[PDB]
Amino acid sequence: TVPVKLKPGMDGPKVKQWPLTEEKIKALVEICTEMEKEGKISKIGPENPYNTPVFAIKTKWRKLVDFRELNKRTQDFPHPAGLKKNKSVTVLDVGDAYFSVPLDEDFRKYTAFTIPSINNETPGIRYQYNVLPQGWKGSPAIFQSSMTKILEPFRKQNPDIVIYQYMDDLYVGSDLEIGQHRTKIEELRQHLLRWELHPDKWTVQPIVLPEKDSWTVNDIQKLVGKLNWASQIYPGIKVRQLCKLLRGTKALTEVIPLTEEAELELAENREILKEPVHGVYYDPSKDLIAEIQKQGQGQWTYQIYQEPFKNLKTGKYARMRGAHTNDVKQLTEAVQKITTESIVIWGKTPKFKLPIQKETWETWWTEYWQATWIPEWEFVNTPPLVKLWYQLEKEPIVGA
Amino acid sequence: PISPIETVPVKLKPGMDGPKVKQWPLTEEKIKALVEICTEMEKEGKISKIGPENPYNTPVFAIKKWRKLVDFRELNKRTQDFWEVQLGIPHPAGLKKNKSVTVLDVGDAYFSVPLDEDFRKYTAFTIPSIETPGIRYQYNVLPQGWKGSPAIFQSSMTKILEPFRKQNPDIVIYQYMDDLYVGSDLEIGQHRTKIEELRQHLLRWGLTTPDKKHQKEPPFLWMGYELHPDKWTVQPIVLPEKDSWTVNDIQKLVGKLNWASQIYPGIKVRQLCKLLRGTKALTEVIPLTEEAELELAENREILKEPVHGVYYDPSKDLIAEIQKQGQGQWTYQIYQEPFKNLKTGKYARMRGAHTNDVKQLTEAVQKITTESIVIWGKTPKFKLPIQKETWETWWTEYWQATWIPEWEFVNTPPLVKLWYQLEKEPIVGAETFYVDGAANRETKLGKAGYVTNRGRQKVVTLTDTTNQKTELQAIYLALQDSGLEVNIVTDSQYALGIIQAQPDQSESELVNQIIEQLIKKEKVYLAWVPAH
Numbered sequence: 001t002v003p004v005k006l007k008p009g010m011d012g013p014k015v016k017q018w019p020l021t022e023e024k025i026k027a028l029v030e031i032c033t034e035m036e037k038e039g040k041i042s043k044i045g046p047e048n049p050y051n052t053p054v055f056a057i058k059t060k061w062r063k064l065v066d067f068r069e070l071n072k073r074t075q076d077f078p079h080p081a082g083l084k085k086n087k088s089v090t091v092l093d094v095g096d097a098y099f100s101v102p103l104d105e106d107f108r109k110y111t112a113f114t115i116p117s118i119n120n121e122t123p124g125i126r127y128q129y130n131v132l133p134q135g136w137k138g139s140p141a142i143f144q145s146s147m148t149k150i151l152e153p154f155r156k157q158n159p160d161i162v163i164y165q166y167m168d169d170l171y172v173g174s175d176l177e178i179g180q181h182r183t184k185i186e187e188l189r190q191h192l193l194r195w196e197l198h199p200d201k202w203t204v205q206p207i208v209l210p211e212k213d214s215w216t217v218n219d220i221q222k223l224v225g226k227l228n229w230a231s232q233i234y235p236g237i238k239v240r241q242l243c244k245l246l247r248g249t250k251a252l253t254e255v256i257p258l259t260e261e262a263e264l265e266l267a268e269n270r271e272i273l274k275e276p277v278h279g280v281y282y283d284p285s286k287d288l289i290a291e292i293q294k295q296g297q298g299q300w301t302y303q304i305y306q307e308p309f310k311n312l313k314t315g316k317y318a319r320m321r322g323a324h325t326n327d328v329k330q331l332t333e334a335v336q337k338i339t340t341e342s343i344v345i346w347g348k349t350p351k352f353k354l355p356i357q358k359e360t361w362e363t364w365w366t367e368y369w370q371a372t373w374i375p376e377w378e379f380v381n382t383p384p385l386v387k388l389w390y391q392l393e394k395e396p397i398v399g400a
Numbered sequence: 401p402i403s404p405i406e407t408v409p410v411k412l413k414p415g416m417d418g419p420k421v422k423q424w425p426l427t428e429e430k431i432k433a434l435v436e437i438c439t440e441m442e443k444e445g446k447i448s449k450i451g452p453e454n455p456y457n458t459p460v461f462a463i464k465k466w467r468k469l470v471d472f473r474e475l476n477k478r479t480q481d482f483w484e485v486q487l488g489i490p491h492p493a494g495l496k497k498n499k500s501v502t503v504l505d506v507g508d509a510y511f512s513v514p515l516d517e518d519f520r521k522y523t524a525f526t527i528p529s530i531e532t533p534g535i536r537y538q539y540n541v542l543p544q545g546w547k548g549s550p551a552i553f554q555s556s557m558t559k560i561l562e563p564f565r566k567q568n569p570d571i572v573i574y575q576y577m578d579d580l581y582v583g584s585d586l587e588i589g590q591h592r593t594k595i596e597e598l599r600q601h602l603l604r605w606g607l608t609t610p611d612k613k614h615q616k617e618p619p620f621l622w623m624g625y626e627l628h629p630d631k632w633t634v635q636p637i638v639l640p641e642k643d644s645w646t647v648n649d650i651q652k653l654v655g656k657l658n659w660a661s662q663i664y665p666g667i668k669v670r671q672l673c674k675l676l677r678g679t680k681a682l683t684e685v686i687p688l689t690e691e692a693e694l695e696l697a698e699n700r701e702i703l704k705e706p707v708h709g710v711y712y713d714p715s716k717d718l719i720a721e722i723q724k725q726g727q728g729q730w731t732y733q734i735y736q737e738p739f740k741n742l743k744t745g746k747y748a749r750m751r752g753a754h755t756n757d758v759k760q761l762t763e764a765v766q767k768i769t770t771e772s773i774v775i776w777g778k779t780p781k782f783k784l785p786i787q788k789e790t791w792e793t794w795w796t797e798y799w800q801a802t803w804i805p806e807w808e809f810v811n812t813p814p815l816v817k818l819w820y821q822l823e824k825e826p827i828v829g830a831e832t833f834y835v836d837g838a839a840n841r842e843t844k845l846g847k848a849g850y851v852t853n854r855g856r857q858k859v860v861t862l863t864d865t866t867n868q869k870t871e872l873q874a875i876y877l878a879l880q881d882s883g884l885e886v887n888i889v890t891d892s893q894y895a896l897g898i899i900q901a902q903p904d905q906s907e908s909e910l911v912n913q914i915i916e917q918l919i920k921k922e923k924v925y926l927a928w929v930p931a932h
């Protein structure tokens with residue numbers, strides 16, 4: 001085993017376990033006993049003060065540990081820009097690989113986790129890892145030499161296919177037709193068994209200003225307000241001529257004929273929004289940020305950026321079948337999608353700005369989480385304009 | 401007797417050292433009592449007579465025959481941290497009904513467990529003299545009052561318990577501080593035998609169980625409740641009768657009464673709380689008002705109510721009904737079968753900066769949901785005083801992500817509804833007030849008013865005001881002077897928020913007035929436009 005340590009001055013994580021459903025507790029209990037036997041983990045005393053949240057996801061349960069805090073405190077240790085171009089990418093869960101590898105003995109105490117007992121009837125069961133834990137930053141790292149080795153063949157055999165490893169995940173991307181792609185994957189899983197994304201289509205949609213037979217005082221008002229704000233992203237947007245028609249105290253419903261200057265002004269603005277603001281470039285030294293707005297009726301808008309108004313990417317996510325009566329479900333779904341694209345494109349997860357109440361999210365997000373990694377997040381209060389603005393994003397002619 | 405169980409490796413906090421606290425000098429009458437108590441422990445193997453080698457020391461005292469008290473506050477400051485000793489406490493509403501239960505006070509099981517030999521030296525203390533060298537000792541077992549003792553004990557029990565636990569699944573043991581709560585549904589004969597079996601097993605590890613004398617018997621007092629076999633009750637709540645009430649008394653009283661509002665229906669403390677206004681001292685005597693006297697009266701009577709509940713039958717549904725007692729005040733009860741509650745509650749009015757009832761409704765739903773999961777590990781089926789069409793109309797459009805687990809409508813007034821819904825579009829044929837308000841934020845002098853499309857106008861002069869207040873006031877006037885249908889334009893940023901969240905309650909009296917007004921209109925359209 002190689003000696004791993006925490007960043008200088010960093011102490012072990014002591015994150016409190018959130019309550020879990022009986023169903024989930026039973027599951028973890030079963031899962032952990034089995035691991036205990038296989039010597040993957042061991043019960044621990046109270047002398048170990050650390051702890052990390054744990055839970056179960058998905059028809060059987062998979063154990064998911066929340067190592068965000070530990071990953072952060074773990075000492076530090078490349079991205080293939082070609083992945084983002086590939087026609088299709090399939091993701092694979094390779095966390096099982098780790099269990100074989102032993103975790104340095106002196107570091108194990110920091111992986112300590114707790115299984116909760118319903119109605120505090122019994123103190124929870126304490127465990128710590130002996131082997132590489134899935135979800136920990138160090139695991140994919142430590143098990144790197146080993147991963148290359150097992151990948152070399154397939155890679156060298158197919159230099160046309162790009163493979164990228166993120167945490168427990170492996171993103172394999174090629175250009176073959178759908179069938180020939182899925183075939184190459186199995187050839188890989190088989191290769192691994194012995195030890196559906198599409199980037200080229202992720203098109204950047206533009207902001208689209210309304211167009212009306214006739215405009216009303218209101219129509220302009222709402223319009224001028226949005227253009228004004230948007231002025232922060234495109235300095236060339238002008239509302240002068242538009243604000244002139246808005247002179248006086250007419251009824252909000254009265255129709256205003258447009259001057260030709262206003263018509264041109266509107267035209268220049270439409271042309272400016274035709275494309276994404278210039279000079280936006282990704283910076284590795286800076287964190288990625290993803291903001292989500294609830295547009296409502298299953299529609300959501302997001303923008304990935306590092307500097308305000310300098311979007312690296314923006315998009316729309318429509319809820320998925322069988323998620324209607326659940327806001328939280330849609331949101332977690334979208335968070336996972338966006339995080340995925342984020343990894344695919346930059347090889348890292350963005351910190352999230354979620355339009356939801358801390359308590360609301362922390363009570364139900366795990367119920368629909370399906371990735372092995374967990375992004376960072378913070379809760380916010382959507383500024384009405386930001387919402388109105390991206391609500392203006394263009395959509396397919398008929399669809400797709 | 402001590403236990404033949406492995407010790408847990410204890411360490412002192414990072415780099416710090418063992419305590420060197422001077423021994424508080426005592427009287428010959430106390431030294432004698434300690435010397436004795438210590439000789440008894442010494443023979444029990446709990447403490448070891450030691451030499452000068454030890455540079456550490458903790459103060460020992462004498463309280464009441466006499467009882468010894470060692471002050472480890474210092475050692476505790478220098479002792480490593482442990483996994484928090486179960487912080488959440490067991491709630492009666494979460495107890496499955498067992499046919500039989502037995503309490504086993506593994507009391508001084510603290511002294512029952514050995515101390516990591518490596519660590520014992522830091523526990524050294526000294527029995528003074530009548531000037532001459534005192535008698536030195538050190539603990540060979542978990543000390544009473546020491547930081548890690550509770551944690552270690554609990555764990556020790558745990559190991560010891562693993563076997564039996566594993567051998568008798570149809571049985572349940574609840575670990576809590578000094579006691580073990582053991583229940584089952586076998587036959588009283590069989591149960592009793594297991595108890596005796598467990599008991600016996602414990603002694604097998606130097607851990608000895610109670611005496612027919614200390615054995616506690618139902619009902620059981622759990623956090624103010626009384627635990628009866630087939631149901632639970634509340635220990636009687638006593639409201640002292642006096643002719644002289646001090647501040648302290650009233651607060652104390654309000655305290656006890658607040659807790660009671662959880663279990664008892666109808667408890668009120670408004671008038672009593674009023675008494676605290678401008679109080680200058682705790683010992684200050686505040687004469688009860690007439691209303692205060694009555695309130696207190698009616699409450700004395702409500703506490704004469706035999707409030708009771710049932711236990712947890714997992715094989716049965718879990719239901720939670722909610723009511724809106726007042727604006728921001730919510731009451732709820734969780735029962736499996738009608739009228740047989742397991743637990744009930746009320747959430748103190750929340751004073752947000754701005755929000756609405758449907759929102760507050762989900763918040764109640766969410767605190768309850770989290771509660772349930774801790775108590776039962778499941779989430780209840782909700783009976784909420786709100787229509788499905790209402791819920792649907794609000795949630796689908798609200799800027800924030802929200803949700804309510806499976807629920808159903810229960811028509812039990814008052815019902816929670818949307819007090820108003822701003823128009824999606826400008827209203828045709830409705831006046832259009834262009835409102836606006838400005839004010840020297842420094843001189844706090846300002847004006848506000850409007851100018852409708854129909855030519856109507858106004859401006860009001862205001863002193864001691866802020867720009868926000870003027871703007872909102874501009875909106876308020878518009879609302880006043882308008883008809884049941886009105887369009888309002890405003891460059892107010894705070895109005896933008898209203899359009900988004902359409903709050904029906906806030907912290908500003910102003911907003912409040914506006915809301916009242918909004919509520920009263922038949923149709924309102926609020927449009928925002930940038931300033932200048």
Ligand SMILES: Cc1cc(S(N)(O)O)ccc1NC(=O)COc1ccc(Cl)cc1C(=O)c1cc(F)cc(C(F)(F)F)c1
Pocket residue numbers: 490491495496497498499500501502572573574575576581582583584618619620621622627628629630711
């Ligand atoms: C109160 C009672 C007496 C009898 S009996 N043996 O007839 O006297 C049988 C069942 C019950 N009660 C029940 O059915 C439900 O209660 C229980 C069901 C199972 C178990 Cl093991 C304990 C209780 C308790 O009453 C209880 C009492 C306490 F002081 C503290 C605690 C706790 F562990 F949570 F801290 C639990």
